[PDB]
Design an enzyme around this catalytic site. Structure first.
Site, mmCIF file in Angstrom:
data_model
loop_
_atom_site.group_PDB
_atom_site.id
_atom_site.type_symbol
_atom_site.label_atom_id
_atom_site.label_comp_id
_atom_site.label_asym_id
_atom_site.label_seq_id
_atom_site.Cartn_x
_atom_site.Cartn_y
_atom_site.Cartn_z
ATOM 1 N N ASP C 47 0.844 -1.187 0.000
ATOM 2 C CA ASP C 47 0.000 0.000 0.000
ATOM 3 C C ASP C 47 0.880 1.238 0.000
ATOM 4 O O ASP C 47 1.558 1.520 0.993
ATOM 5 C CB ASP C 47 -0.926 0.007 1.216
ATOM 6 N N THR C 80 -4.034 6.067 -6.130
ATOM 7 C CA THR C 80 -3.044 6.929 -5.497
ATOM 8 C C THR C 80 -1.676 6.277 -5.530
ATOM 9 O O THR C 80 -0.689 6.886 -5.957
ATOM 10 C CB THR C 80 -3.444 7.178 -4.052
ATOM 11 N N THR C 81 -1.608 5.030 -5.066
ATOM 12 C CA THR C 81 -0.409 4.224 -5.237
ATOM 13 C C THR C 81 0.000 4.187 -6.705
ATOM 14 O O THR C 81 1.188 4.089 -7.029
ATOM 15 C CB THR C 81 -0.671 2.815 -4.693
ATOM 16 N N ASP C 378 -13.689 -0.659 -1.846
ATOM 17 C CA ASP C 378 -13.236 -0.664 -3.230
ATOM 18 C C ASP C 378 -14.410 -0.664 -4.195
ATOM 19 O O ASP C 378 -14.463 0.166 -5.107
ATOM 20 C CB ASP C 378 -12.363 -1.884 -3.502
#
Lengths: 66, 107, 509, 102, 127
Positions: C47, C80-81, C378
């Site tokens: 993450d 974002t990752t 999610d």
């Protein structure tokens, strides 16, 4: 809204307002504009008789004079 | 939230408590300011009669006193109801928030 | 003060070294990152976000990446990752060439000339998904929820996100805001199990409900939002001196009461039984609601009432002096306060406003509840993405090598200076193949060729590599899909940042 | 412990009529008024001693000005013994607390 | 939990009675304000020349002949006598109610909250 081509200058002021038409006149002319910073919203009658509430009764005869 | 519901039941609680104790002596000081007139009405007429609003006894004709003192009757005669008007609404007002306490709990 | 070609190279270094380690953590196949602290704290994560927190940033570019990292995280919280992996490439590619070929400006405009060609390619590779078919959403979801690797009770409750989020889809703004997640308001149930966890309409109200404050069960009677403006008026519209001594207790607190009794009536006139009043309540406002034996629920929060304004989907009263059932307590509505496990749970349901539905979350513990909700998170984000753009796109390098050509084809076409930024930007697309070829542990350079070979005819339409299958694949045969929503967002996101840091040559104290 | 409470009475001692002053202080503003409000319309008296002292405006004018000033003056005498008594009882608090705990 | 609230309950009851005792006694000081006003009311009402039975000393009273209505005291300042005008004194007879009622009445809601502070300790002391 609509299209960038129909974007246009607008005669008189730009006015965004919750439309006052319940059946209000939609058009007028030579308009005296009373713009209300204050709400109206039903001033009661607490100045007349019966401003005292010991009972739900006293709301009725206030509601007639307001 | 029951805090103001518990707060209003405390304040109007001690609000109404005064109108009960006063109203009866207001009838008394009504009745007695009739009686104190009757008390000077006891002796048919006197110059040595006094009615006064203080440590001073300002020498007064008992007649004007009979007026003034039945007037003094009328003083305490009226104050019974304005208390009873206090006594009327404040009894209900304390329960207004209490009505809000219990329903929301019954709810 | 930090300035100049350093910060220029620093705009490279930070976003680079950030993005560098993180692509290994990308993908369902992902290479985890260890942390240690002088404190001893150990972190094993794929993450980026969680990493992006405990890591330290001594460069504001490295700090502002966290910012733009949270941007996509504000937005979704996944990708974002991914976003950081894009610009970190870009500056590490175009700049040292093109800033020593001297410009902030060229690639900046070319970042847009990059941004559009994706969108261009996106109008091809992204192909519509319907929310009518659950699996057609849920296969993305099943792919999206297995990203965090719990398919267990998340998946079936992802239907609930496939429902609640889709069923709190509402509010056309006229360009149609409707596509959304947030209006879905999760339920928290001690006891129950994600099996019996299933939507109720509107918003199921857990938050302020530890116990019934609104009756027990209410069907027709209107759940009613009273919103501030229930405070007294001792005059007509005015407020005079308040209670002081004997008859002011009477007269004044009566003056307070009439105006509110007048406010009270309009509530009772629309036939409530439960009435949820947020802050700005009078005990005057309740007791006539008590005189009608209609419970007035006071001093409860706004979002909760907005949940309730989404629960029966009534509005919030904007003129509490003149009230409508159209205002609050719309439709027939429902209010049901149910103990499920420990806590009484108000369910304000039968929602008007286009449905509305919230995710009922019942874990046995709150853990077996939470594991679902996190992967549920999610779906409900991918649900809104499917709501946002319901065009499922082939995953992997399918979009990557596609846009790359189309950018280099745009290089061939435009043949300007920004052709080089394209070939610099089109180079950024290959991350996913490299990321996946890393995460599969294969040889990229053949698969780089082979994917260019996949674009040579197929145009990499559905064909990227998928490191998770380890091979260059159609993503229809693998059923790998994402909305054009999530793609362009993540795509555009770092492009902006690729502009952003490149803008910055200077730090001043 | 008595050490906590020991000097607080000596404290509030000098504070006691100092508070009484501060109403008189307020009414000293009022007697300045009610002297200025009295042109001699009705007699002005400093009542000092069991004897009524026939008095005058100018006799009481400085006086009420002097009184108000003086009715501010018994403030400072407590302000003297204010931080005398509250401070030393502030040390005493720990002295016999632990000894009695000991 | 309980013993500290057994210890803390001590002061809050005083804070109750601190406020309870004070507010009740200022009406007594207001009694004289309307009194002297009323004592000046009937004073101007009748005339100068009425016999005045005025306190001589305990168990006794002394008569007297009133030659001045308009001559009327106010007590302000410190130990001070202002004999005022009939309306002047009345005005301060009146007005001295007004300021004292403010200091007096403010005490009642603080009375409640000290109990609401004590009653809150009572519960947590019993719970």
């Amino acid at each position: 809204g609509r299209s960038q081509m129909e974007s246009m200058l607008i005669s008189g002021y730009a006015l965004n307002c919750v439309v006052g038409s319940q059946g209000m006149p939609k058009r007028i002319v030579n308009a005296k504009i009373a713009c209300l910073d204050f709400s109206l919203q039903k001033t009661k009658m607490k100045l007349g008789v019966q401003v005292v509430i010991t009972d739900p009764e006293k709301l009725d005869q206030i509601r007639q004079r307001e | 939230a029951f805090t103001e519901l518990q707060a209003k039941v405390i304040d109007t609680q001690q609000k109404v408590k005064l109108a009960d104790i006063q109203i009866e002596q207001l009838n008394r000081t009504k009745k007695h300011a009739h009686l104190t007139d009757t008390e000077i009405m006891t002796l048919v007429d006197e110059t040595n009669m006094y009615e006064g609003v203080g440590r001073m006894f300002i020498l007064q004709s008992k007649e004007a006193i009979h007026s003034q003192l039945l007037e003094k009757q009328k003083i305490a005669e009226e104050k019974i109801k304005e208390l009873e008007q206090k006594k009327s609404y404040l009894e209900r007002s304390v329960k207004e928030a209490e009505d809000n306490i219990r329903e929301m709990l019954m709810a | 003060r930090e300035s100049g070609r350093k910060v220029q190279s620093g705009n490279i270094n930070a976003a680079k070294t950030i993005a560098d380690i993180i692509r290994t953590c990308l993908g369902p196949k992902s290479m985890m990152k260890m942390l240690l602290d002088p404190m001893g704290g150990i972190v094993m994560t794929n993450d980026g976000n969680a990493i992006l927190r405990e890591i330290q940033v001594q460069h504001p570019a490295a700090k502002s990446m966290i910012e733009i990292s949270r941007t996509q995280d504000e937005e979704v919280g996944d990708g974002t990752t991914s976003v950081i992996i894009l610009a970190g490439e870009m500056l590490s590619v175009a700049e040292h060439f093109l800033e020593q070929q001297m410009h902030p400006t060229v690639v900046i405009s070319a970042y847009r000339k990059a941004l559009d060609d994706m969108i261009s390619t996106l109008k091809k590779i992204s192909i519509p998904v319907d929310i009518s078919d659950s699996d057609m959403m849920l296969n993305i979801i099943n792919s999206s929820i297995t990203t965090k690797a719990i398919s267990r009770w998340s998946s079936l409750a992802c239907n609930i996100a496939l429902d609640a989020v889709k069923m709190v889809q509402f509010e056309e703004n006229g360009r149609k805001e409707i596509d959304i997640k947030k209006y879905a308001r999760v339920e928290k149930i001690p006891g129950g199990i994600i099996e019996d966890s299933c939507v109720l309409r509107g918003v199921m109200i857990n938050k302020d409900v530890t116990h019934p404050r609104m009756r027990r069960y209410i069907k027709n009677p209107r759940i009613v939002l009273l919103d501030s403006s229930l405070e007294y008026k001792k005059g007509e519209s005015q407020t005079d001196i308040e209670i002081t001594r004997e008859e002011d207790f009477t007269r004044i607190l009566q003056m307070e009461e009439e105006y509110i009794q007048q406010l009270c009536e309009d509530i009772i006139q629309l036939k409530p039984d439960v009435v949820i009043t947020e802050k700005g309540i009078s005990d005057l406002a309740q007791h006539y609601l008590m005189r009608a034996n209609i419970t007035a629920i006071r001093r409860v929060r706004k979002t909760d009432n907005n949940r309730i304004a989404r629960a029966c989907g009534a509005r919030i009263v904007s003129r509490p002096e003149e009230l409508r059932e159209d205002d609050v307590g719309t439709g027939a509505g429902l209010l049901e306060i149910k103990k499920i496990g420990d806590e009484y749970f108000t369910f304000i349901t039968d929602c008007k406003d286009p449905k509305a539905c919230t995710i009922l979350l019942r874990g046995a513990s709150k853990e077996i509840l939470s594991e679902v909700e996190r992967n549920l998170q999610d779906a409900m984000q991918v649900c809104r993405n499917v709501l946002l753009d319901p065009q499922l796109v082939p995953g992997g390098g399918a979009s990557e090598m596609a846009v790359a050509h189309a950018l280099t084809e745009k290089s061939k076409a435009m043949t300007g200076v920004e052709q080089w930024p394209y070939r610099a930007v089109a180079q950024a697309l290959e991350v996913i193949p490299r990321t996946l070829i890393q995460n599969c542990g294969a040889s990229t350079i053949r698969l780089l060729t082979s994917l260019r070979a996949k674009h040579t005819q197929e145009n990499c339409e559905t064909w990227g590599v998928n490191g998770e299958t380890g091979t260059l694949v159609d993503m229809k045969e693998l059923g790998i899909w994402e909305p054009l929503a999530v793609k362009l967002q993540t795509y555009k996101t770092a492009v902006e940042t690729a502009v952003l840091l490149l803008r910055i040559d200077d730090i001043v104290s | 412990v008595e050490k906590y409470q020991q000097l607080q009475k000596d404290l509030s001692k000098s504070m006691s009529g100092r508070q009484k002053l501060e109403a008189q202080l307020t009414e000293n503003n009022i007697v300045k008024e009610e002297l200025a409000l009295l042109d001699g319309s009705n007699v002005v008296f400093k009542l000092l001693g069991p004897v009524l002292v026939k008095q005058e405006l100018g006799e009481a004018r400085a006086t009420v000005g002097k009184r108000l000033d003086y009715i501010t003056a018994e403030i400072k005498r407590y302000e003297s013994q204010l931080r005398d008594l509250e401070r030393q009882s502030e040390q005493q608090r720990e002295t016999l607390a632990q000894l009695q705990q000991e | 939990n309980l013993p500290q609230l057994e210890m803390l309950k001590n002061q809050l009851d005083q804070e109750v009675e601190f406020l309870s005792t004070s507010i009740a006694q200022l009406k007594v000081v207001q009694t004289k304000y309307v009194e002297a006003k009323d004592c000046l009311n009937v004073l101007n009402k009748s005339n100068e020349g009425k016999e005045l039975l005025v306190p001589l000393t305990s168990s006794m009273y002394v008569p007297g002949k009133l030659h001045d209505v308009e001559h009327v005291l106010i007590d302000v300042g410190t130990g001070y006598y202002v004999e005022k005008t009939a309306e002047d004194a009345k005005d301060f007879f009146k007005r001295k109610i007004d300021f004292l009622t403010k200091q007096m009445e403010k005490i009642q809601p603080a009375l409640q909250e000290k109990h609401a502070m004590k009653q809150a300790v009572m519960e947590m002391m019993s719970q």
